[PDB]
Design a protein around this ligand. Structure first.
Ligand SMILES: CCCCCCCCCCCCCCCCCCCC(=O)O[C@H](COC(=O)CCCCCCCCCCCCCC)COP(=O)(O)OCCN
Lengths: 53, 293
């Protein structure tokens, strides 16, 4: 009939089409510093074990 | 004999069945599906249906293959899995983990024999590819074990590889070697990243696909059993005393990594094992050796 599916008056609200770049976070240097610290702690634990044994 | 063997074998069978159920339960959860619900209500009984049904299916007479080797391949795998678990839980063998390494080098035979049964020109290459992967990542596992033995000493100070003594202390120094042990364990179980088979095996290139009865059943059960053994070894060596929860968690981790990572091509994984994993494991070995006693 005279009533058909027509877009609502004023149009539809805007949508997002483009991609979102989310590459934020931890990087290489922090991992290196953390690994270095963990390795030092491991070396200390190793020495303590090797002496007690 | 001893009553302990019953107390080891029965838990392995139950656990392997629920390992198979877990594999799909996790994959469904990752893909917004649900655990199988038509087999029963709780879902506890889902694997038993598959095994019992596989028993019912009519046997197929062997074709153009030696009967002995065909029967032998399941027996070999079902023997290696049993010996491994029973030497992991019920023995005091000073070099017990070295024995486990030997038992893992014998898993190559089952794949090879299965390939031989096909006797196809394509299948000869396909089996050679699988065995190449297993031997290549077994070398790396051996180097990692060498790293494990430098840090493992007993109360009397005697160097050894007793699973109870390596388990007794947790050493954070070894964690760099545990990552390599975990990647190699993925490779030895032919998980997705190192799952060369699936792409080649869509067509009948050759594999355990030939069996379709009690023979096929044991292979799949053994596959999960080996994966669980690797999880136990990762726990016993790098994560302290044996914990059932940890073994299950490591298996779940295997499934998670499987899901999240695409497979590799033949050349790529083998190039990773020779020119990436092996130099890293050698550097970790030399570093641990140079740290000293
Ligand atoms: C840098 C610090 C400076 C100090 C020097 C120390 C050197 C590092 C020593 C630390 C020991 C830990 C090393 C971790 C293992 C990684 C091995 C090396 C990394 C690597 O080369 O990348 C790829 C190997 O990883 C892979 O891709 C294997 C496949 C991975 C699939 C399965 C992954 C499982 C999850 C990861 C393990 C996590 C455990 C618990 C979840 C090769 O690839 P490439 O071709 O790019 O390199 C070739 C480029 N010419």
């Amino acid at each position: 009939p005279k009533v058909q599916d027509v877009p609502p008056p004023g149009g539809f609200p805007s949508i997002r089409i483009e991609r979102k770049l989310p590459n934020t976070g931890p990087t290489g240097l922090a991992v290196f510093l953390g690994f270095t610290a963990f390795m030092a702690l491991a070396v200390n634990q190793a020495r303590d074990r090797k002496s007690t044994n | 004999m001893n009553l302990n063997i019953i107390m080891t074998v029965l838990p392995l069978l139950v656990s392997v069945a629920f390992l198979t159920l877990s594999e799909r339960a996790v994959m469904g959860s990752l893909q917004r599906r649900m655990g199988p619900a038509v087999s029963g209500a709780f879902g506890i009984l889902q694997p038993f249906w598959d095994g019992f049904k596989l028993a019912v299916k009519e046997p197929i007479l062997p074709a153009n293959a030696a009967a002995g080797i065909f029967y032998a391949a399941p027996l070999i795998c079902i023997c290696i899995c049993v010996a491994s678990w029973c030497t992991l839980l019920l023995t005091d063998l000073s070099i017990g983990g070295l024995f486990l390494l030997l038992l893992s080098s014998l898993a190559v035979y089952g794949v090879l024999l299965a390939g031989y049964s096909c006797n196809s020109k394509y299948a000869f290459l396909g089996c050679l590819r699988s065995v190449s992967l297993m031997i290549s990542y077994e070398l790396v596992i051996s180097v990692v074990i060498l790293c494990v033995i430098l840090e493992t000493r007993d109360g009397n100070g005697f160097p050894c590889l007793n699973l109870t003594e390596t388990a007794s202390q947790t050493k954070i120094i070894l964690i760099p070697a545990g990552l390599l042990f975990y990647i190699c364990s993925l490779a030895e179980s032919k998980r997705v990243p190192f799952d060369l088979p699936e792409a080649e095996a869509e067509l009948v290139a050759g594999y355990n696909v030939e069996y379709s009865s009690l023979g096929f059943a044991v292979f799949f059960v053994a596959e999960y059993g080996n994966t669980l053994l690797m999880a136990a070894l990762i726990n016993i060596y790098f994560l302290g005393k044996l914990n059932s929860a940890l073994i299950a968690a490591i298996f779940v981790s295997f499934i998670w990594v499987r899901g999240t990572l695409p497979r590799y091509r033949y050349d790529m994984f083998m190039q990773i094992g020779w020119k990436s994993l092996l130099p890293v494991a050698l550097a970790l070995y030399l570093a641990q050796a140079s740290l000293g006693y």
